[PDB]
Paper text:
The DDRs are constitutive dimers at the cell surface, and residues within the TM helix are required for signaling (Noordeen et al., 2006). Collagen binds to the DS domain, and the structural determinants of the DDR-collagen interaction have been extensively studied (Carafoli et al., 2009; Ichikawa et al., 2007; Konitsiotis et al., 2008; Leitinger, 2003; Xu et al., 2011).
The extracellular region of [name] revealed by the crystal structure is a compact structure measuring approximately 70 × 50 × 40 Å. There is an extensive interface between the two domains that buries 1410 Å2 of solvent-accessible surface (i.e., the interface measures ∼700 Å2). The interface between the DS and DS-like domains of [name] is formed between the bottom of the DS domain, in particular the β4–β5 and β6–β7 loops, and the long convoluted insertion between strands β1 and β2 of the DS-like domain. A key interface residue is Trp187, which is located in the short linker between the two domains and which interacts with residues of both the DS domain (Leu94 and Val160) and the DS-like domain (Leu191, Leu192, Leu228, and Ala232). The calcium ion is coordinated by the side chains of Asp233 and Glu361, as well as by three main chain carbonyl groups; an analogous calcium coordination is seen in many family 32 CBMs (Boraston et al., 2004). The collagen-binding loops of the [name] DS domain, which are opposite the DS-like domain, have weak electron density and high temperature factors, suggesting that they are quite mobile in the absence of the collagen ligand. The 3E3 epitope is formed from three regions of the [name] DS-like domain, which are discontinuous in sequence but contiguous in space: the start of β3 (Ala279, Gln281, and Ala282), the β6–β7 loop (Ser 335, Pro337, Gly340, Arg341, and Val342), and the very end of the DS-like domain (Ile365 and Asp367).
Author numbering:
A (entry chain A): 30 to 369
B (entry chain L): 1 to 30, 32 to 211
C (entry chain H): 1 to 52, 52A, 53 to 82, 82A, 82B, 82C, 83 to 99, 101 to 126, ...
Write the structure that this text describes.
Amino acid sequence: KCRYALGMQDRTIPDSDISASSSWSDSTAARHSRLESSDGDGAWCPAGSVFPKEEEYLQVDLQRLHLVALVGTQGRHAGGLGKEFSRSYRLRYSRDGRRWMGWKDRWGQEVISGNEDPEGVVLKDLGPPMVARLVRFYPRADRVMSVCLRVELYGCLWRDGLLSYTAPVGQTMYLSEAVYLNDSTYDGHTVGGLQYGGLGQLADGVVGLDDFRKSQELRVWPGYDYVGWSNHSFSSGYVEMEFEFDRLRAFQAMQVHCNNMHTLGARLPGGVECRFRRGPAMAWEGEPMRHNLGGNLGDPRARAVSVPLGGRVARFLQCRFLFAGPWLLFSEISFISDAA
Amino acid sequence: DIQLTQSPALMSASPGEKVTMTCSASSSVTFMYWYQQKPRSSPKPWIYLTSNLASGVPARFSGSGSGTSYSLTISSMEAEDAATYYCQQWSSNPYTFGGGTKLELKRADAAPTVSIFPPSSEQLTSGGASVVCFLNNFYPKDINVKWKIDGSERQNGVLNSWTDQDSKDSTYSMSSTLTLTKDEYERHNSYTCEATHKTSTSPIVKSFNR
Amino acid sequence: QVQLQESGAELVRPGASVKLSCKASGYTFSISWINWVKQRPGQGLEWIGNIYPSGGYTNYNQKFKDKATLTVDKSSNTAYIQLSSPTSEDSAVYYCTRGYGHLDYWGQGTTLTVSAAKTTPPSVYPLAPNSMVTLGCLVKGYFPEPVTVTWNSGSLSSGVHTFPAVLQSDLYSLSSSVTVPSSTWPSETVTCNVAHPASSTKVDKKIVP
Ligand SMILES: *[C@@H]1O[C@H](CO)[C@@H](O[C@@H]2O[C@H](CO)[C@@H](O)[C@H](O)[C@H]2NC(C)=O)[C@H](O)[C@H]1NC(C)=O
Ligand SMILES: *[C@@H]1O[C@H](CO)[C@@H](O[C@@H]2O[C@H](CO)[C@@H](O)[C@H](O)[C@H]2NC(C)=O)[C@H](O)[C@H]1NC(C)=O
Ligand SMILES: [Ca+2]
Ligand SMILES: [Ca+2]
């Protein structure tokens, strides 16, 4: 249940939070880009023509981190005499306001087919969704035609407060048909064999299936929903991940959704240990919290391993997941906490 | 503000039976916690994060559910499982507890072992005189006591107290204390303690004389 | 041994300031939350609020917003809960407990009595009378609660039945029985050890035939 209109039509989002790179006139300023609104001369329209160069855009500041799962666009209806609209567009979002990223769907496509007339509202299912603070719409024109936008953002608040998670690149198991357990949508960097500075499949609200080879999404490879690693690749015997949060929080629990199809190599982690850091010092808040999982479990259905975190206050987390079988498969990792 | 409702509010079961109480939340909570408590004792954590068994907790137990419904299931009820169980939500202040499911145990009926006691030399030498009467380990709860002073009934100064089910034998016990004055007492000779119970039609009578 | 030791009893006149203690040990005190749960006899449980030593962060239950105040001496590993103006209903058993969600350890709780009445130790009277015998111990006239009772210094745990205290003239009466083989008493000593925290009383009483 994460599809609430975030405020354009609604008015929650104030003019001050809606900028743009230029308006044709003051009758077509950013403030007029609210979905279903007639303010100004119908909507927002770039000043300069969106020539082969695609640099014009509308920007929306949501203030707090949000999981945007959808967007709706519209054209300049203006009473009924409006005849302009954006046929297609690209999206860029940001969390810290300095580092921007381009949205690309699960199948590598950046462009989003937009409107067909000025009136109608076209909705777009952002798969994968984006965790953002700021969102930019870059109107697209393929010929010299006057574009205009009117937008809406759907989703919900990002209450987890997870800014990013570090982790080893996803490996692949060669099993009859190659299974790719890499983080497919990670929106950060990936130097060496390590991902950092971003978010991906482990934090997208999608949980994997019991059989990790088959997924709920279409046109994707086997293993898509998961991010897994193999025991033999890590002499230490555990996968290590570091998590950074928006603010100082009291951690109640951590929840990992894992695959337990031991028939193919995947078993729940043997145990889970996490260290906490509140930020300033270069030291860990205290002794770590090691949690062992009763046993290996009979049934192969994926389950949600819940780790108690003692309500320990901190802003950085460094957990380790002990292997219990040849492989370890995760499809999601959630944190339950309260801001102190 | 997210209050929990537990059903049954009170329930009994036979040994070896598969008991199972419920916790319903006016709203959604990420987890539910269960604690166990026995009369005049601190609650103990029984289950945390919906289904994890707290240390020392026997295998027979388990928990589950989600959203607004949750439950605590007991594989095979034993005698020691007899207690009141409270569920708790920690998804929103104030972290409230449920009403609590009081779990009583079922077992064969048992007659009461009555024991009468004459006020001691210590109390007497203070103008006081109490006569105690113990009717221990009986089943079921329903029991009636009677005091007598010289073949006659007395009901002034008689105080009673009960105890819930024993964790070992699953029985009940009660203590009646007939309190008089050293004088009010040294003026009669036959004090009696009668008690009728469904295990016997004729009341069980214990008594002493001076 | 994670321990949250706390006073057994606390007595104060209505409207007067009262402060319940809870000394912790057996783990890094500064990084765990200390909670306080309130419970009136035979009634349910009520969470008052908690405090996280390292940081001073707190959480109050609106309901006690203006009744209580949590603090912690991160020196003696003690946590306090203050009550500004006591009022009968503000008298019950107070438990300090560690944890945030999973309340893993609980103290013995403090029995707080809001009363103008003065503290009075208990007077302990022995109770003497085929396969087994049943001895007894009568604890009459004490205030306030609670009162502890063990036989043979806890040596005798089986066959014991300590009954709930009762009131009359704002004074408590407690009774305790113990059943042992007729072949152990009177040849062996059976002693009743009563304790009253409020009055700091530790009284022993042998049961003589
Ligand atoms: C995640 O792993 C998949 C493995 O398939 C990567 O997708 C493949 O990328 C290669 C590189 O050009 C293509 O030739 C394949 O056709 C892709 N898979 C398909 C569609 O069969 C994907 O790039 C990886 N994601 C990242 C960025 O690590
Ligand atoms: C992860 O891989 C290691 C190394 O291959 C496994 O440890 C070896 O296991 C074999 C038999 O399984 C033993 O005979 C060796 O003595 C082990 N080598 C070591 C660690 O010295 C390990 O079992 C694998 N992890 C799991 C639990 O599957
Ligand atoms: Ca996911
Ligand atoms: Ca993947």
